[PDB]
Structure 1
C-alpha cells in the first residue's frame, strides 16, 4: 500500500526523444518548465508518479 502519493492525469504526461516521461508545469512566475518523471504504473487513467 502506497502512502500519500501523486496520481498525474494521462493527458499531461508524455515521452520524448529516446528518453523518459516528462510533463510541462507552470512555475511560480507563470513560466512553463519541463519536468522529468518516472511514471511507470497506470491507475485507471492516471500515472502513478514516483519521482519528479
Structure 2
C-alpha cells in the first residue's frame, strides 16, 4: 500500500556498515560522550549506495565511515565530516 506522505527514513550508506555471518548488520557510531559504541541495525533494502535502516539508527546519529579500518568499541575520537 502506498500512503501519500513524504515518507522519511534513515538511509545509512553501506560505506559504513558490515554484515557478519553473512546476514547480521552491525555498525559503529560515536555517542555524545565522544566514545564509539556498537549498535545492531536492521537494514534490509538497498537504495543507490545507502541502506534503508528500519530499526537501528535514528535521526541525528553519527555514522563512522572513514576510520573503521583500525578501531574498536569503547574508545574516543575526533569528528571530521
TM-score range, shorter chain: 0.7 to 0.9
Give 1 or 2 for the bigger CA radius of gyration: 2
More strand by share: 1
TM-score w.r.t. the length of structure 2 is: 0.53
Distance 1:31 1:51, change over 3 A: closer
TM-score w.r.t. the length of structure 1 is: 0.79
CA RMSD of superposed structures (Å): 5.9
Uncovered stretches (5+) of structure 1, i.e. residues with no partner: none
Aligned residues: 52
